[PDB]
Design a protein around this nucleic acid. Structure first.
Ligand code: DG3
Ligand code: NA
Length: 535
DNA sequence: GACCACGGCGCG
DNA sequence: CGCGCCGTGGTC
C-alpha cells in the first residue's frame, strides 16, 4: 500500500493484468509487485517482465506461460490459489478465494499484487498444522505448476490441411443424412434444434417418449433415448449418425485449425490446476483432454495430432489405474490377487461369474468394473448392456460377492465422511461433502456417490501428477517434451533417435511412481501421430 | 457484441 | 463419478 518505484525487491508477489484469459494469446496490460506491504508498478510490463526471477502470486503459471512465449525462462512459484485449493477444492477462482479470505479480486495489477500478498499470509497459516497438505503443496502442486507451464508453452502440432480436407468430406455425408432424415420426416426442419426434433419424433411421427429432461421436463431426445428407439423406427438410426458427425465437425474438425498460434505454428491448451473437486486437472481453450477416439471418425481426428518433423510421439497409458487404486485402498484379497498374478482383471472378473478362466463376454465384467466406481445403479447397467433389468441387478451382486472388501471400504469411507465432513485421497487430499446427512434420500445418496468415488479418482490423479513431476526433469535431460496429459495417459514427443529410450524410461518412472499393494502397469506406444502412438 | 441456461455429448 | 464445449433459444 505504498508507491515504491519499479523494480521490486527479490521475492515479491506479482499482480498482472491480461487482455484475455489465455496467456498464450493475451496482451500483457499491467505488471506490479508487492513485498513488505509495499507496491511497485512497472512503467512498461513487457520490459519489466525481464526483471523477475520467478513468478509468485495468484495465477503464477499463466504469467510464466506468457513469459516462455517471449523466450523468458520465468518459472512459477508460490500461488495462494494452490493453497486455497488444497484447503478446500471448491476454491477454484480468485474472485471466490479473495472474498473468502479477506480480499477483493480487482482489475488493477497492484491491487492484485497486494491481494496476492495478504491472501498468501492468511492461507499459509491455515496450512500450518496440516503436514500432509503441505507435502502435497511442496512435492506435487508447486513443482507441477512449472511442468504444466512448459506443456502449455510447447503445445502440440496439428495437421491442418488434413483436417481441412476431412471437413469437406464430413460435410458431404452430413448433407446426405440430413436429406434422408428430412425425407423420412416428410419435411425439413432444423435437425440441430433439439426442440424441433422432439416435435417430429414424438408428435408428428408417432414414436413413444421414453424420458424427460432434468430442468424443463421436455421429452428427451438424448442418445440413450434414441438407442432404445433404434428399431422402433428407421429415422432414429440416421439421427444418431447425424449427431455423431455434427458433434465431431462443430467441436473438433472445424474450430481446431483456426487455433494454431502464429509464432509457434502449434496448438496450445490450458491445464487448469485448480478446477476439479477430485484433484484431477482440466483442459480448456481448447479442451485437448477429450479429443475423439472411440469411433471410426474419432480416430481419423486423432491422426491430425502429429509429431514435429524429425520427432516421434510417445504415448503412455496406465492400465486400469482407478481399479488398482481401489484394490490398494480397500485391501480386497481377490482383487489384489488379480493384479498380483498379472492377469487381465476383466477376463478375471468375467471368470468369477463365469469360469474361471477365459470361458460372459468381455465388456460384461468391464462395464461393471467401471461401474462400481461411480455407484452405478442396476437399471443403468441394463441399458448399457442391453440386458434385462433383473439380469443387471444380479450381475452386480456377484461382484460384491467376489470382492467383499470393496463394499466394506465404501461403507467405511461414508461413515468417516459423515463424521468429519470430508473424504481423503491416499495422500490426504480432501473434499468436503456435507450432504452425506441430508434428509432427502436422492440428495444424500448422490452425495454418497461423489464421496466414495473421490478418494479413488483423486488418488489416481495424485499418482499421475507426482509421476509428471518426477518425469519432467528426466525428459529435459534427453531433450524430450511433455505435450499432454489425459487423466491416466501422457503424450510426449521425442527425437526420432531417442524415442525408444524415452519410452523405456518414462514407463519405469510412471510404474514406480509410488509402489502399492498392487503393481502399476503402463502401456507405451511410439508413432508419427497420436493414433499411431496409442494402442 | 457479451452472456446465460439447457440439453446433449466428447474424454478419462 | 469428474470435467469443457457445442448449438439453440434467449436477454441486455
Ligand atoms: N471407454 C470408457 N472409459 C471409461 C468410462 N468411464 C471411465 N473410463 C476411463 C477409465 C479408464 C479409461 C480407459 O479405459 P480402457 O477402455 O482403456 O479400459 P481397458 O481396461 O484398457 O479395456 P481393455 O482391457 O479392453 O483394453 O477410461 C467409460 O464409460 N467408457
Ligand atoms: Na500457479
Amino acid at each position: 500500500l505504498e508507491e515504491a518505484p519499479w523494480p521490486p525487491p527479490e521475492g515479491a508477489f506479482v499482480g498482472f493484468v491480461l487482455s484475455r484469459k489465455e496467456p498464450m494469446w493475451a496482451d500483457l496490460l499491467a505488471l506490479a509487485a508487492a513485498r513488505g506491504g509495499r507496491v511497485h508498478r512497472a512503467p512498461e510490463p513487457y520490459k519489466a517482465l525481464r526483471d523477475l526471477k520467478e513468478a509468485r502470486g495468484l495465477l503464477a503459471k499463466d504469467l510464466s506461460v506468457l513469459a516462455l512465449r517471449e523466450g523468458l525462462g520465468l518459472p512459477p512459484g508460490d500461488d495462494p490459489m494452490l493453497l486455497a485449493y488444497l484447503l478446500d477444492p471448491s476454491n477454484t477462482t480468485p474472485e471466490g478465494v479473495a472474498r473468502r479470505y479477506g480480499g477483493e479480486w480487482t482489475e488493477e495489477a497492484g491491487e492484485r499484487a497486494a491481494l496476492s500478498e495478504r491472501l498468501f499470509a492468511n492461507l499459509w497459516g491455515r496450512l500450518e498444522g496440516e503436514e500432509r497438505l503441505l507435502w502435497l503443496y511442496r512435492e506435487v502442486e508447486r513443482p507441477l505448476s512449472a511442468v504444466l507451464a512448459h506443456m502449455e508453452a510447447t503445445g502440440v502440432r496439428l495437421d491442418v490441411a488434413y483436417l481441412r480436407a476431412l471437413s469437406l468430406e464430413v460435410a458431404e455425408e452430413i448433407a446426405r443424412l440430413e436429406a434422408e432424415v428430412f425425407r423420412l420426416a416428410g419435411h425439413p426442419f432444423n435437425l440441430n434444434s433439439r426442440d424441433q426434433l422432439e416435435r417430429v419424433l414424438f408428435d408428428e411421427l408417432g414414436l413413444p417418449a421414453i424420458g424427460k429432461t432434468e430442468k424443463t421436463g421436455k421429452r428427451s431426445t438424448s442418445a440413450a433415448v434414441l438407442e432404445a428407439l433404434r428399431e422402433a423406427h428407421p429415422i432414429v438410426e440416421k439421427i444418431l449418425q447425424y449427431r455423431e458427425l455434427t458433434k465431431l465437425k462443430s467441436t473438433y474438425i472445424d474450430p481446431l485449425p483456426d487455433l494454431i498460434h502464429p509464432r509457434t505454428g502449434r496448438l496450445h491448451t490450458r491445464f487448469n490446476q485448480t478446477a476439479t473437486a477430485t484433484g484431477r486437472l482440466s483442459s480448456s481453450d481448447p479442451n485437448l483432454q477429450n479429443i475423439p477416439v472411440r469411433t471410426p471418425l474419432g480416430q481419423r481426428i486423432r491422426r491430425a495430432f502429429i509429431a514435429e518433423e524429425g520427432w516421434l510421439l510417445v504415448a503412455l497409458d496406465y492400465s486400469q489405474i482407478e481399479l488398482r487404486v481401489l484394490a490398494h485402498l480397500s485391501g480386497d484379497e481377490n482383487l489384489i490377487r488379480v493384479f498380483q498374478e498379472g492377469r487381465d482383471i476383466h477376463t478375471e472378473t468375467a471368470s468369477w461369474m463365469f469360469g474361471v478362466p477365459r470361458e460372459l463376454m468381455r465388456r460384461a465384467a468391464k462395464t461393471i468394473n467401471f461401474g462400481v466406481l461411480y455407484g452405478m445403479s442396476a437399471h443403468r447397467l441394463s441399458q448399457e448392456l442391453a440386458i434385462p433389468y433383473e439380469e443387471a441387478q444380479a450381475f452386480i451382486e456377484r461382484y460384491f460377492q467376489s470382492f467383499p472388501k470393496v463394499r466394506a471400504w465404501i461403507e467405511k469411507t461414508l461413515e468417516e465422511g459423515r463424521r468429519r465432513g470430508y473424504v481423503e485421497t491416499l495422500f490426504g487430499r480432501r473434499r468436503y461433502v456435507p450432504d452425506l446427512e441430508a434428509r432427502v434420500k436422492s440428495v444424500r445418496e448422490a452425495a454418497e456417490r461423489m464421496a466414495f468415488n473421490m478418494p479413488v479418482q483423486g488418488t489416481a490423479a495424485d499418482l499421475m501428477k507426482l509421476a509428471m513431476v518426477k518425469l519432467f526433469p528426466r525428459l529435459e535431460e534427453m531433450g524430450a517434451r511433455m505435450l499432454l496429459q489425459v487423466h491416466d495417459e501422457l503424450v510426449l514427443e521425442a527425437p526420432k533417435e531417442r524415442a525408444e529410450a524415452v519410452a523405456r524410461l518414462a514407463k519405469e518412472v510412471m510404474e514406480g511412481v509410488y509402489p502399492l499393494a498392487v503393481p502399476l502397469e503402463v502401456e507405451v506406444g511410439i508413432g508419427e501421430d497420436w493414433l499411431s502412438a496409442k494402442e
